Structure 1
Amino acid sequence: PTNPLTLIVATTPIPTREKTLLGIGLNGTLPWPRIKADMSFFARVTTRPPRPGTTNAMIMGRKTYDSVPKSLRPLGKRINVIVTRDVEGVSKRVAEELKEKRAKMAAAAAAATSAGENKEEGPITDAIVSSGLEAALEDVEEKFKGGLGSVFVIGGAEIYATALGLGGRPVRIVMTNVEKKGVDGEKAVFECDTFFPIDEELLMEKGWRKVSAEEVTEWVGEPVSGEWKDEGEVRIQMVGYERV
């Protein structure tokens, strides 16, 4: 049987007359000020190997790649897989950014060593560029073999849409819900130009099941309560959905 594909996403609800939309992006970035708890959660979960000596891959659309600040990318300690229709051009630029990243990470390792820090086996950092999502999945399987850890689809909307359309991989969604705190017992809504490709079918569980906190916990390898938690002007909670 074939390994699960996990979409991981943060959404914000936007009630419209016809349905609640799930906003994910505005102007090529996220819709909200930085949420430290979502960031660290995303980082720990996407990095965490499912067994020793493996590295997780994140499959992303080219715009989501670009949405990460250049100095932080490709994102460390994972295999970054950038899906594009211009492999040739994007390859050259990713290769360049990887090389700069390698340079930053090497200097840090040398410094860490130099100040008497304990080093240990950890997941590796790579970036590769593919012509499609299916191509990306193939490409990472072929390059990494049994060193491949968990595969995450990290966005954005076009790539998620493609994941959800793949021919029957179980697909699971690990979702962080983001809401503004009420002001006069009313909650404002974030402006978004990019939305998750499905919304009502998750909130109404049509073809999807919302899973126990214990099940999310197993997927992501750290405790998830499914409780709301306050983070400044937002509250957030983590939930999961499996296709039925």
Structure 2
Amino acid sequence: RPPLRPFSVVVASDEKGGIGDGGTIPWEIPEDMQYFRRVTTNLRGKNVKPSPSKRNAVVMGRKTWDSLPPKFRPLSNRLNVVLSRSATKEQLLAGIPDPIKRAEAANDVVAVNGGLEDALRMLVSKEHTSSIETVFCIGGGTIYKQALCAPCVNVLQAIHRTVVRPASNSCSVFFDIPAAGTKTPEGLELVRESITDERVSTGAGGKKYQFEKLVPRNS
């Protein structure tokens, strides 16, 4: 009251909950990159192609948007919602180097002067409940923290986590989630719905990874 649009988290973290060094993701796992793209891009049902009339949204902090290599700004086929206390939509667009692509990106980027909560209230609007199918929170550290506590955590439907091993020695930013069998002080307990068997990445270092899905426990 007002309600918050339900959402899912997509993240890649190691055993220490490390997700980044403050500016970028330390490891290179191309299989996770591809999976992230498909998971956040894919729409429900058969043969539904993303468009302004219906697509998914990815919500991220301004630093995560900046971490995006300019050539991938904005994330294609998805509404990009950037949280920033100052950066305007125009200022976000100005960071897109290809001027033609920038002209096209005008309808794919939205700047929110607020946190995840503000984004979730906005994504409930008559204009987004129909045009936005699924809302994915994609980072970073500060946004994940907001995602895991009230009032956001209350509408959290799932966490698509890519488990990375071995632990990185460059992570200073984390994704703090209660271990299996534990419930956070606020009351959040996560249950593993599924997890792939460990696989070795073709990227540098050959990091081992698993695609795991977690959902809040609903006794």
TM range (shorter): 0.7 to 0.9
Q: TM-score normalised to the size of structure 1? A: 0.71
Q: Which amino acid aligns with 2:101?
A: A
Q: Identify the match of residue 173 of structure 2 among 170, 194, 201.
A: 194
The offset of 1:57, in angstroms, is: 0.3
Equivalent AA in structure 2 for residue 129 of structure 1: A
Aligned partner of 1:152 in structure 2 is: 136
Root mean square deviation, CA, Å: 2.7
Task: Assess if the C-alpha contact under 8 Å between 1:164 and 1:171 holds in 2.
Answer: no
- 2:209 pairs with one of 208, 213, 236: 236
What residue ranges of structure 1 are gaps of 5+ in the alignment?
A: 14-20, 107-123, 181-187, 214-224
TM-score, scaled relative to structure 2: 0.79
Question: In the alignment, what sits opposite 2:164?
Answer: 178
Distance 2:199 2:174 in 1: 23
Local SS of the residue matching 1:50: coil
Partner of 1:8: 10
Q: Report 1:104-183 matches (<5 A).
A: 126-131=108-113, 132-142=115-125, 143-167=127-151, 168-180=154-166
Distance 1:177 1:126, change over 3 A: same
Q: Which residue of 1 aligns with 2:19?
A: 24
Match of 1:221 in 2: none
Cα offset, 1:173, TM superposition: 1.1
Count of matched residue pairs: 197
CA contact 1:82–1:127 (8 Å) conserved in 2 = yes
Q: Does 1:44 align with 2:38?
A: yes
Partner of 1:209: 190
Whichever structure has more helix as a proportion of its residues is 1
Counterpart-to-counterpart distance in 2, 1:105 and 1:237? 38
Rg larger in 1 or in 2? 1
The 8 Å contact of residues 174 and 240 in structure 1, kept in 2 or not, is answered as yes
Deviation at 1:210, TM superposition (A): 2.6
| Equivalent-residue separation in structure 2 for 1:9 and 1:94 (angstroms) | 23
Q: CA deviation at 1:125?
A: 6.4
Shift of 1:241: 1.7
Alpha-carbon distance in 1 for matches of 2:38, 2:99: 19
> What amino acid is the match of 1:169?
V
Q: Residue 155 of structure 1: SS of its match in structure 2?
A: coil
1:60 corresponds to: 60
User: For the residues of structure 1 that align with 2:159 and 2:198, how far apart are their CA atoms?
Assistant: 18
Return the offset for 1:211: 2.7
* Structure 2 portions without partners, runs of 5+: none
Change (3 A) 1:189 1:158: closer
Report the AA paired with residue 179 of structure 2.
L
For 2:128 and 2:97, how far apart are their aligned partners in 1?
A: 19
What displacement does 1:72 show? 1.1
